[PDB]
């Protein structure tokens, strides 16, 4: 992906994080587990929801064909009518298919971005109080108990304290 | 002791297309095209049609 996180330096996703799209896995002396970053997650849900509704709604006004009939000596205008109706169907078919392709690409990249930013958010808190392992993980120099871990997820990680 | 960043995966086989890649497996997708019909001529909002038959 464009942002290098998903299927990049973070090799794979987590079956074990069920509760959100992005989040944290912690590991210390007390144990280990997954925790979803709900805010980043809810941001993503609002964006994707709006997108879908934007797509659905933009295609709201669109060409509606009507039945028109013509006799045996009106072949020219019958052909015109047919070319006209087919022409608009092809145009709207193109618009729909291309919009889906373009916005699918942007949706996948959007998720990649949200992950990259969540990773950097944590990196920028910890700074040189942890080893950046290069795989999505940060190994602490100090012991980091569950409250310590929570403060990382908080945005509250007190850097001067360590 | 360590903390790691990651993302959701699941058992989904739903696929979507993009410009640069086709058949990308995603965790979730939403179909927006109705493909089926009941194969019958019906009352429209309760008001029966005029069926001229032959």
């Amino acid at each position, epitope marked *: 992906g464009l942002f290098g996180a998903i299927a990049g330096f973070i090799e794979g996703g987590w079956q074990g994080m069920v*509760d959100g799209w992005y989040g944290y896995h912690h590991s210390n002396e007390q144990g280990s587990g997954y925790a979803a970053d709900k805010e980043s*997650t809810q941001k993503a849900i609002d964006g994707v929801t709006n997108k879908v509704n934007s797509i659905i709604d933009k295609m709201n006004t669109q060409f509606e064909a009507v039945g028109r009939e013509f006799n045996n000596l009106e072949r020219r205008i019958e052909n015109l009518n047919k070319k006209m109706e087919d022409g608009f169907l092809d145009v709207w078919t193109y618009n729909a298919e291309l919009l889906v392709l373009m916005e699918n690409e942007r949706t996948l990249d959007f998720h990649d971005s949200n992950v990259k930013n969540l990773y950097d958010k944590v990196r920028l808190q910890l700074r040189d109080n942890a080893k950046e392992l290069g795989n999505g993980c940060f190994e602490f120099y100090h012991k980091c108990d569950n409250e310590c871990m929570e403060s990382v997820r908080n945005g509250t990680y007190d850097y001067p304290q360590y | 002791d360590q903390i790691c960043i990651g993302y959701h995966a699941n058992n989904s086989t739903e696929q979507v297309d993009t410009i640069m890649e086709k058949n990308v497996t995603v965790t979730h997708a939403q179909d927006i095209l109705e493909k089926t019909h009941n194969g019958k001529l019906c009352d429209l909002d309760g008001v029966k049609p005029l069926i001229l038959r032959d």
Partner: antibody
Amino acid sequence: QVQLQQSGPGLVKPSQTLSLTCAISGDSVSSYNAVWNWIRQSPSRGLEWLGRTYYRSGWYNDYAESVKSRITINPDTSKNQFSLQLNSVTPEDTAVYYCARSGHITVFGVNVDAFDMWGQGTMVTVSS
Amino acid sequence: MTQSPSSLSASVGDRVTITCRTSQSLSSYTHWYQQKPGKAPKLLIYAASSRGSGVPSRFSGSGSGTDFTLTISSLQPEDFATYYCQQSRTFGQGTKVEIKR
């Protein structure tokens, strides 16, 4: 429709182990679109989520911080049930215990922890 | 999660609104339950505003930032209950709706 049928004794002596079972019908304990939870309720403490188990290419458990050192929740894929075990009970563990399914209803495939089906409840009294 | 009021009396046909102020605002995680005495809770609303299966149209939910609301447009006798809001694994304390004389 999914039904959850609870069982287990409603009387536990102090310091001993509370043991409950939830038997599932209409769904699989190992379903990818289910999460299996225990929640308790007491007049004092209100509604309290205790823990869960679920299967996603392997079994996972999460437990509430308040009970983490005493609690075990195990699936049984032979009998399509899951259990609650709570060790070293005290009077404060007196409550109605409910099993409940979550993650059946998801926003964009993400379990939001919205419980959609609950068992009937087992009233548990800690007393000698 | 803080619910207000902790209880209320309203007559049949009344418009009823209950509020939950959450620690932090997420629309998708918030949910509402209705519990009648001695029964399990029933899911009423999920993700702030989606009606649960089999839940009648008089119930709706709204969310703005950290404030979430459940509204019963026209109270019926059967809506005597305690209503709870919830996010992630945290519940509000509940609101008792009694049917006021």
